[PDB]
Amino acid sequence: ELIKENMHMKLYMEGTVNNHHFKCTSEGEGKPYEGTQTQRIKVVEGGPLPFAFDILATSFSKTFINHTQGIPDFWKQSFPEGFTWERVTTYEDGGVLTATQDTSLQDGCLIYNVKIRGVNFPSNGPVMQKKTLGWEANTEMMYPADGGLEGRNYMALKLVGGGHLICSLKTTYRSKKPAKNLKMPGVYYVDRRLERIKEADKETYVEQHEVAVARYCDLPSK
Amino acid sequence: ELIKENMHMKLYMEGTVNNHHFKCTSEGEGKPYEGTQTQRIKVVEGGPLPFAFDILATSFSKTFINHTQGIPDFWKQSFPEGFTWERVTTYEDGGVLTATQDTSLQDGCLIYNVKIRGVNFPSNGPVMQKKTLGWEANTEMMYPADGGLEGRNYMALKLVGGGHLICSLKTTYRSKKPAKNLKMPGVYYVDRRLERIKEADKETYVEQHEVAVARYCDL
Ligand SMILES: [Cl-]
Structure with a gap:
């Protein structure tokens, strides 16, 4: 089909956090219907980053969610136009980060273009002091809003010495497909796990893996 | 154990939303270890309420969470002292609701005292116009913090005509028991479904059911 059982991706990202400009690129692959993917990510400008790579991590792929049960797949059906x-x-200590991304398809390859603008991350905070250790696994709540899809969630960023830095994510997802061709889902939930395969040179190379599964609440109902 | 396989509860609630004062009481029972419970709730002052009963729903019970896998039960372990x-x-349209709750155990019955303050609900929004149809199921993120437990989540309130009103919940759970005697859990999640069972006399009487299960992320 248009999204094959195996798909490649290339990503270009540019942004500023606080006042440090950077660019990253990446290349990877995964199994869109199995909900798994890997990306090999290089910091290509502004390295080494003087802030935790962790704050970029959720910016690097919605087509790779395993949509179980009934759930219509908002993203896989947005192609060929994409989304x-x-x-x-x-972040609860200050830090605000805005990300905006364009997903498109050329020649069976998925292309991501991401822009990042982060500000007010505290100078001696764990993000700017690079005192972080990855994200807890978690659940994005998906619900229809407008002629688009909206996601809400709280993530917990593990800190050196234990404890967590908490942040809220408010995401708006829009298709470029007319809408009349789009079967939009009801409310559902996406269980995700973000992990690293390997990293090196002060996180200027990071290989990042995601498992993502979309579901209805499995609890029974009265 | 002093939290048994079936437990009863009684609740007293007072508060004010958008300057409308109100009091509620409730009684109920459930199965703590299975994570189920029902409450039968009455508005005893200020009824009928000029705002959606739904904004009060999460303020009516943490002892009744089915802790699966490893997870140390902060709440059940908290008695006799309670929490x-x-x-x-x-709410994303302005509305802020503050709640402060005391949970006790007295004569084998769970006792809840709750106080509530709600401000800035838009006067023509779905809350003050009672256009709401209950809460989507959700997952609360639980983590150790500040000597106790904090909880984070977003909840989605169903509106007439099919949309949602989103709110964030930020919760601090404080045990009255000395922290030395508690086995503290790591990061975990609590899947909940809170379902209206019945509603009479313009939400002046409400039956409410919850099912709640603690877990880790299973992928
Ligand atoms: Cl997300």
């Missing part, structure tokens, strides 16, 4: 997404992540 | 919770719920 966009836009997010504000608000 | 408190306190919460800010912030």
